[PDB]
Amino acid sequence: DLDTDNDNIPDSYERNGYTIKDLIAVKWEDSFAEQGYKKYVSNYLESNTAGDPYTDYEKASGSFDKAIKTEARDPLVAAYPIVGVGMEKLIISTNEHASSINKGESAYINANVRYYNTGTAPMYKVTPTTNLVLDGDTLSTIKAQENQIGNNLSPGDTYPKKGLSPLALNTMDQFSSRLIPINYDQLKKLDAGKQIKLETTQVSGNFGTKNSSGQIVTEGNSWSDYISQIDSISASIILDTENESYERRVTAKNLQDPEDKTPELTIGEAIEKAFGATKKDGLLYFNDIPIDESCVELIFDDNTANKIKDSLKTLSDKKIYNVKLERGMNILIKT
Amino acid sequence: DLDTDNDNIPDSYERNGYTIKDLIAVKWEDSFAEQGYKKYVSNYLESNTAGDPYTDYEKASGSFDKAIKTEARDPLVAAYPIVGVGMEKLIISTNEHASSINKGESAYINANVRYYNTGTAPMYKVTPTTNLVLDGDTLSTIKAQENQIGNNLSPGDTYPKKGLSPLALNTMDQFSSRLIPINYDQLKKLDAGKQIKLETTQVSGNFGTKNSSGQIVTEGNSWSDYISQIDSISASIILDTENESYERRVTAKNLQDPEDKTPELTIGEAIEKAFGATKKDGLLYFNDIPIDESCVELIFDDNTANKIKDSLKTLSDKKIYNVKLERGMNILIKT
Amino acid sequence: DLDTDNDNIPDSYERNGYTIKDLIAVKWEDSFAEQGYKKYVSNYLESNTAGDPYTDYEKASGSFDKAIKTEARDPLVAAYPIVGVGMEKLIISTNEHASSINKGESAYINANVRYYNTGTAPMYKVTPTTNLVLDGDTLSTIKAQENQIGNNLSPGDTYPKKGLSPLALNTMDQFSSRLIPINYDQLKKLDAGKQIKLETTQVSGNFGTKNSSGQIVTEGNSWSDYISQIDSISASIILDTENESYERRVTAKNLQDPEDKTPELTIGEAIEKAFGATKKDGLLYFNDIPIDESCVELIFDDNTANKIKDSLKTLSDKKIYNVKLERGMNILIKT
Amino acid sequence: DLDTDNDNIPDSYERNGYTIKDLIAVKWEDSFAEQGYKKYVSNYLESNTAGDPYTDYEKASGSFDKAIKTEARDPLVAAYPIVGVGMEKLIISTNEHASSINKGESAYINANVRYYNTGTAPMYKVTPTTNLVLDGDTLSTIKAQENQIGNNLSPGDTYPKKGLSPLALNTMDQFSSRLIPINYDQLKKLDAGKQIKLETTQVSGNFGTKNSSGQIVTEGNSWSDYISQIDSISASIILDTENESYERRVTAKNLQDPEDKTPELTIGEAIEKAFGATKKDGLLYFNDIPIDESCVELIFDDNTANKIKDSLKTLSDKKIYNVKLERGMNILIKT
Amino acid sequence: DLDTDNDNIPDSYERNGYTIKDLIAVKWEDSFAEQGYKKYVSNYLESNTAGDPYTDYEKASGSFDKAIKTEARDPLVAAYPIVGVGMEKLIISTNEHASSINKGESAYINANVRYYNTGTAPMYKVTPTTNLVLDGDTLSTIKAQENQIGNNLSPGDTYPKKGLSPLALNTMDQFSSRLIPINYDQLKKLDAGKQIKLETTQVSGNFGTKNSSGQIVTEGNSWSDYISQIDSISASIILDTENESYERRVTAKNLQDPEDKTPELTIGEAIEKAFGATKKDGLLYFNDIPIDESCVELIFDDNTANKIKDSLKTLSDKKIYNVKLERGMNILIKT
Amino acid sequence: PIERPEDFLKDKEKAKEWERKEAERIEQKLERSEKEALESYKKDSVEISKYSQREKEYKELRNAISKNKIDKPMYVYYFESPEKFAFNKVIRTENQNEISLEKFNEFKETIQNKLFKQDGFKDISLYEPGKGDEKPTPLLMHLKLPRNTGMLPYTNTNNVSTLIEQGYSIKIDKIVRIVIDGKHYIKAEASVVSS
């Protein structure tokens, strides 16, 4: 009956819980739990609670790119593609002149790469900016060109899909006509037994917005416009299954900001909402493998570790999973 | 009378089945089966059901490009061009200097290739990104340039049509001015008897949108904006006849999501809708060859095999053509 | 009750102090002090008090790109990304022909660089112009190309983030195809032991505006349009903590202009507003470290020093933090 | 009460003198001098009196790019960036092949340059054309490319700011991929001791306008559209102080045109309005140094000298600062 | 009181003569000549009576690019920038290989040129297409590239202004990267004492409108869209003073069209209007030197001489300054 | 109308592009009479609108714009002063950013179960006009227009507006309390019940 930020969700519904039925917003009741509906809470002052381009209504009603995983339908989870690049092989092409060698243009490297999406989103024009390193020395920072642009990185899928060979990476120019050089010093250092490593400094791409009736527009809508905002107002949770990795970013409240009206979440609730787990017998299960604190290994960095120590020494239950999640903590879950 | 997804077809008609009479929709009856009209049921919550760009009204009325096969007019089938690249021959040119040889650019390749369409749609500007491999090491990944770009790839046809020679692929740069090099090691590996294979990682194409008058626009519209959505809400069915192949995708329902209002289909209904087969003597026939379970061989992968395994132990009829169609199965039918 | 600059902040509120509640402007009362709210005083004549692209209302309400720090929400503090480039390692590649040397292009340089941000704003497409100097001889001035471009430079973060390797600058041509040349004389100077320095002459970047409902566009929006404006109407404040640096710019009042109505700020008030410091026992503390004048080292240039001495001779408090902050003063604070 | 040129200033106000209070125009009174207001007289028949892109209302109210100096607020002074290029060093790279010399491309030149703005306006994309002359022959003319383009050039500032080494210039192609050639003749002339001079022919740039809610915009607004008009209807006055030089262009009335209604100015009044000097004790002082004709040296060209001699012999006061300023006069002041 | 082509000028005013006062047209009277006004007569059927892009009202009122000369304010005189290229020096670079010569690229030239404007308009992006000829054989035709493009060629000025060195033109490709070649035969002809001449075929450029809201736009407004129109409906008159040359195009009347309603002009009135001469004692004076027929040399081509003979034989005054000016005449005036 | 939804939700670029396209496709289909007629409204927009709320201009425009009927139903947004909504009181002024939950409910009680008439020459948009467009009143409208209603785009001076004649009845459904560009507006969705 009163909407401030124009997401077609009233403030009372957003604050007290709501659900989407036949593309309209209704109050949440406990009787809707058995049908498969979920309880949603968002920010009644911000159009996008999580920072991803899709608004609260689009995320809740699922009127977006259907390749987005269903765990991102919750408005508090950021639809945010985490794209890494795995290096599978390296090919050395030395240009010896036999009928002579040059110590500035002595080798050509063709690196076999393979993209990996682990986030809750498809990244429509994957353009990784990868730097090759050896001995801590950065060889080259090259952005993928039109040959190497891999469109359609589905969640949990590699751009050269299963059964296909890795992508080839051998050109540094914007138009793929100049091969990556290596001088004689590091050619001999590579011959001495060292290994080229590859790092992904950043990945550029696009997201498909909905336009007209069923139209999907991908041009001019880049992910880098929202990557910084998402990484600012979120916290990262990484599950490490024996066969897959799942990285999610969940929006968390700010105590020092009184106008920040994002809903409060615990770390356990955030894990449940991010990974789509099931609350059975009070325990959390995600795809027939236990995920609770006593069953897995939790890994944090320094600030998160000290944060949880302070919060535990101030808390009464003395358990990790029922403590407040705040903006900017890294959690790694290993099973 | 009431429409929710706004595709010019009411929700009651959408749930109870419908057919098109003079570019308008009416309630479906069994009497229209004798005149040749089929039964169409689609999703009353999505503007387009199968994931393809065309809306359900356009798919039912056939008001799009007429090169799409007439079985894809069913809204539950996805207008989706599945193409590949068949490599026919290889020409190698070793650029030795006779009066000298360079060990980094000792050879060039001329890959003779031909495009193969098998989906229920053409791409009006075919651009395959194909990699060339040799004994597990990827030679190069090349996206087709303006020379190798092929328009009008009609379904069931090749871009160099029958009677024409295969196209030549010889350039890596965006403008076709740089040949593909091969160093000495891969030259020796080729000359030792090993064969270079070709794979197609991605294909970039256009879909023609038809305006109110006669106007087909294929500029700025890409398939890559929708192939993720189709692979998400679709299931792949492959038919392997001796002379031709037929690859299709049929949307599948998710039982965990209460709002996924896509119609429920069985495997047999999905096959008959995706191939336009007719019900003769209870069985199914596709172009004068039996297709039923007792006459053909059905092959799946591990996940699909397990899915049908548990659903068959749950089911009583114990027939693979009477089992529920779930999201993301791979079916290969060999006759 | 009146608005002259139509920034959606009434004139009396803008002069006497105001705060933002529920994305709307209200008068400031003492009851909001304990709730976490802050007091905003802005200029009542023009739309942007600090000159940065976000208006007074957008700055005060925080309805902009959320990666902007909290202390930039005060209208008298300019949202301003101060971007630097730090050099980590330099690589020298001599192209001696062995079977010969060229005296004009005898060497190629791989420069490992890393981008730093220190202001209250993210630069969404980082393009630094870096000149490499050697004994006063500016060898080459290179703008960052597509390969070395940087998206998502969040405040306090590096474009190659912590744990990632530096980026490689090796191309001077606009398309990254031509390596950086070094002639025989400067190569001899480099081999004698002299070190190449790297300087940043300009940084070109983009800022994201919250277009429509949550949409962000960073194309056509350049920071160079407002670099000069902000550097004109401001005074630069730099803090050098042992682990991090913080550079901001604070709007200053002009006595020579009777129609300049920017609010008066002392140096202490300017520091508190620009840094979000907390007043404990009257003194100023910044994140549990002392920042008051008696506990830090102040460094000024000639203009700031002369103005400070003259205004302190005029004043009676004889404290640097209690004097009016003028336009165009450089203040460096070290702890 | 009546406005003819539609510039939001009444014609009677423009003719009798006016000042801007609360961003609106009011008639001038003598009591406003004690508050710091400056008397403004404009032309009521042309929208832009000085010819610069900002209108009379914007110039008088100061509602333009705030980096524009306060001296350009008077509508009779043209906001006009006088930008020059200064050589600091020249580096010559001899292209000898050592194991050979080419007589057409024997040497390459690295020109270290630094920009200098002196007018009352900032130029936002400083692209100068420098011609390198030697012994009367123009070796080359070079427009600055993307590497040498310098944005955000504030008045009185150098694009490589004070503290940074000068910018390098070594390529003539639009994409910086071809060094500047010198044949054996001018190489021998340089080795004989002749020195290369640099001149600036044209200097292209941009200026910032206000666009809707997007604020400052700088693309598509070139100075070259307006510098012809400004240089036509103005007189150029140059001040030479031992620290900085000040170039201004003050609009002048045409006596033979009876529609040219621009205010009539003397040379003394024009100098005072151009430099913002203060008239105390009859004489004019600019930043606390005298500027009157009995304390400075005035330099004219032939046309200005003849005009000034004839007008002095016609006039009775016999003072250079008391005589009418005509169109197209060059005055240089040395202190 | 009636306007046919709605050019803010009534038909009766346009036919019988008018002057402009306060930006509105009024009937011309004999008393207005004392105040400095002029008599304007134009064609009441064409919005541009001379074919130049500015309307008759804009030309009469002077509401155009203000650097246009005062003598082009008369509507019958065409605003037309006549741009020529003068060659000052030739730089010969022989690319002998010393340690060889190629007789196909044996020489490189770097022509020092300078632009001259003579018409009554500034031509805002001068792009001359000049051919270098040698004893009738055109070596190469070069259109000026981005280096050689000179904006702001003001009337009566040179693009390198008086005091600067000539511009260098040395490349013929669009992106300035390859020098101009001369073969063995032409190099030997140059060494034998022959000289290279420089002719201008076309000069492309822009002009300034004011169609935007208070702005001048010179992109897409080319003179080449109007030079043919003016050369069709115009007659060229050239005056050759010792220090300057002045070329004008004055529109003439066709007697074979009953609808060509442009005012009839004699050659005396045309000269007076085209050069702004003053009628002192009946004779014509331009810049205080007589141009009356008794004291000046008039040059015509063959067709003009035949026309002048056939028209003087049917006249009673036998004066060249009295005969009706026809279309497409070339009159040269030498004092 | 080759392809266009009922409502361009907060889409300025697509609305402007399509309105350009329809303006061109109507200009090169109409006759000289409305070419010389619509300039009268273009340069005296208040006069003819407040006259149609001497008959040659009105008749020509009505005939020329009751001939371009729209097929798809549409949703249009225009700012309407709440002085013709039987709300003879004031709600806010132009710059007072506060609306109250004491006159919000008064507006709710004033416009409820009542079909207000709305007829006249007027101007509308095709999108949600926030953050940059003119905001003359604190009441935004969300009219729903059925098939076969008058429509025409026209380019005033490089800027495109759109004219509709109406025999309408608004039939309000609810009232939202939007805050956009730091201001409290009421968005009022209504469904046309044609007479």
Ligand SMILES: [Ca+2]
């Ligand atoms: Ca909300």
Ligand SMILES: [Ca+2]
């Ligand atoms: Ca919300």
Ligand SMILES: [Ca+2]
């Ligand atoms: Ca429907």
Ligand SMILES: [Ca+2]
């Ligand atoms: Ca549907």
Ligand SMILES: [Ca+2]
């Ligand atoms: Ca205000």
Ligand SMILES: [Ca+2]
């Ligand atoms: Ca303000």
Ligand SMILES: [Ca+2]
């Ligand atoms: Ca005026």
Ligand SMILES: [Ca+2]
């Ligand atoms: Ca004016």
Ligand SMILES: [Ca+2]
């Ligand atoms: Ca006329």
Ligand SMILES: [Ca+2]
């Ligand atoms: Ca006319």
